[PDB]
């Protein structure tokens, strides 16, 4: 049985970075060369493992996290990184073992006049824990005055929309990102490469 990497990478619709989508993968085989020899990926970086060795390793579970961010922010999808995305939306631990794959999605996720459907968290009290997914629309208290859940002065809605127009620079353009995580537990290994 082949692993359903198709439905993740070629998903017709991608999630916002604050509410990122996780696909749990197990009990299948995959040819990771179809990824790292793809001509459409603009970013392809792996941590803790060599992508050419992936075809000879077995893993307890694989996690495919997918979302959309700005081009200037793809560099934030890395261990030990600081920034609005890394701190409020999607954090990777220092011992992260996996790959980060990004590609330009201007032709899809940007509309004339603007595609304002992709969001990101701009305010938060504390930094995220690794692989945390916070989706609260709780009003952020930026003053010494209780907000009591009412938007106002020093009371901000925590989520900001992305302005994706096709005329923005490649930086401010939208990028679809997939983060593969390779989990090796002390149980039988069930995801592998071919033979």
């Amino acid at each position, epitope marked *: 049985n082949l692993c359903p990497f198709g439905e993740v990478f070629n998903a017709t619709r991608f999630a916002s970075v604050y509410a990122w989508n996780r696909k749990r993968i197990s009990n299948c085989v995959a040819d990771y060369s179809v990824l790292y020899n793809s001509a459409s990926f603009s970013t392809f970086k*792996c941590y803790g493992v060599s*992508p*050419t060795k992936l075809n000879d390793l077995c893993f307890t579970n694989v996690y495919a996290d997918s979302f959309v961010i700005r081009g200037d922010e793809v560099r934030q999808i890395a261990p030990g990184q600081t920034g609005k995305i890394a701190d409020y939306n999607y954090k990777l631990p220092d011992d992260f073992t996996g790959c980060v794959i990004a590609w330009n999605s201007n032709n899809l996720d940007s509309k004339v006049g603007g595609n304002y459907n992709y969001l990101y968290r701009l305010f938060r009290k504390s930094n995220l824990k690794p692989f945390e997914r916070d989706i609260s629309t709780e009003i952020y208290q930026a003053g010494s005055t209780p907000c009591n859940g009412v938007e106002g002065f020093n009371c901000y809605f925590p989520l900001q929309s992305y302005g994706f127009q096709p005329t923005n620079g490649v930086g401010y353009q939208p990028y679809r990102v997939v983060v593969l995580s390779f989990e090796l537990l002390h149980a039988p290994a069930t995801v592998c490469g071919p033979d």
Partner: antibody
Amino acid sequence: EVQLVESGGALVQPGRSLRLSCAASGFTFDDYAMHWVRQAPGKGLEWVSGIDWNSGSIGYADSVKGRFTISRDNAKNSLYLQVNSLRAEDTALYYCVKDSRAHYDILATYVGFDYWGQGTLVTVSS
Amino acid sequence: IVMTQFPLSLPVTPGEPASISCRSSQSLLHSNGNNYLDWYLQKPGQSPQLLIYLNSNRASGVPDRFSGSGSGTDFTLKISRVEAEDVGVYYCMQALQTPTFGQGTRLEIKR
């Protein structure tokens, strides 16, 4: 500006060793693979060795396997090439060569060898 | 993989186009449709620098006069208007496997 400054090339007797070093600046060193490409005087270009962004994968040319050893210190934005058991055909300029990919042996994200150092000259003579 | 360049030295009058050949032993066409061949220009007294990557793409700062073409085991670099600065040796390289280079082509300016 991207700047790859090589050093360590010297006159060395045959059979001895040398430690080539390459100090990098002007780009995120942690993000790219690194290569050593050499050129004999008046001759063509020869790939020597390459290393991933995190030393995860390493390659060597057949003429240098077992003798040369590539490494990198990502904290010091530096690349190294240990040349051992030296022979006359190792006499060449050794170019530090920046890769566009994080990994030297994958085809994705390839946009050519972005920048080349000016090289350091290694002469093997008695 | 073995790269071979036919014109080892190309004398060309200024303003007149130039053309360089590159044969290879194996096909550099890949499943993803790209031809993994590059062009590198080594100007006098300098190390080589990237000119063309992926057969038909210019590196940063490369004028519109430089173009690349080919597919499989046969490629060609072309210049529309040769200039005096274009002096140097042009090198083939394949990126499908570990990098192999061609013996260079010296570009002479027929003055």
